[PDB]
Amino acid sequence: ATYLIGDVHGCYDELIALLHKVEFTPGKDTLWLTGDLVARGPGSLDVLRYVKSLGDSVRLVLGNHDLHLLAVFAGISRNKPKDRLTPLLEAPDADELLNWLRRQPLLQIDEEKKLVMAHAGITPQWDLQTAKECARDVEAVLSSDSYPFFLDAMYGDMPNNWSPELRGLGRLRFITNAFTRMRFCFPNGQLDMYSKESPEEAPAPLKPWFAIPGPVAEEYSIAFGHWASLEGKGTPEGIYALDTGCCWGGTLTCLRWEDKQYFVQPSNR
Ligand SMILES: [Mn+2]
Ligand SMILES: [Mn+2]
């Protein structure tokens, strides 16, 4: 079976309880994770150890808090006490875990399920070929010996409009924002980097990225996490918002793909 779980944010106990609820069995089952494995919750270290140990039985995409963790590790960004990352950063296997983490994809595609996963979703300005190429570009930087320079460059809110002509820092920044920070779009598909509220609270003419017809969503289902204020609700058919805010006192959600059956684990808070 195929299980998809939204943002774990260090909530190791809830993740394991949820996986036991579905009797997740590596070798028979596969787990897809929407990213943001770390931060806020208390067990980021255990979450990373376990997910890394699953190997081919897990298909991960990186989220914005995973990238932030990498930036702290590399000395690019300051540690916030609120993220609770110190046990992981000071762990004897920190190097092993974070060098594994930075080699994971931004995008997962399963053609037999016609299923696409990214942390924030797929901007309607991208077709599948473009999304694949952009994911590959950023993954090549993250997997290289010079990933700290990229992590330093990624911070920023511009440009917010895709063009195949984009080059250099702006091209990487747009790619990173689209995969890991996107929520609202302007009618032309351009990204808004400021509003984090539910679609109902957003000012016109802002709409959820998934409310704008895009070539990928027309042919593929899209699973994503990241947008906790969505509360997993209000999406069109074929769009699966899996982040139900576990670290925030909400729930951790698991979707079994074969029967679209939901399983939910209450936050331990
Ligand atoms: Mn998150
Ligand atoms: Mn996120």
Curated annotation (Swiss-Prot):
InterPro entries: ApaH, Calcineurin-like_PHP_ApaH, Metallo-depent_PP-like. Keywords: Hydrolase. Transmembrane segments: none annotated. The keyword Hydrolase applies. One of its GO terms (biological process) is response to X-ray. Its EC number is 3.6.1.41. Co(2+) is a strong stimulator (100-fold increase in rate of hydrolysis). Mn(2+), Cd(2+), Ni(2+), Mg(2+) and Ca(2+) are weak stimulators; the two latter act synergistically with Co(2+). One of its GO terms (cellular component) is cytoplasm. GO terms for molecular function: bis(5'-nucleosyl)-tetraphosphatase (symmetrical) activity; bis(5'-nucleosyl)-tetraphosphatase activity; hydrolase activity; phosphatase activity. It catalyses: P(1),P(4)-bis(5'-adenosyl) tetraphosphate + H2O = 2 ADP + 2 H(+). It is an enzyme of class 3 (hydrolase). Belongs to the Ap4A hydrolase family. Hydrolyzes diadenosine 5',5'''-P1,P4-tetraphosphate to yield ADP. Monomer. This is Bis(5'-nucleosyl)-tetraphosphatase [symmetrical]. It comes from Escherichia coli (strain K12).
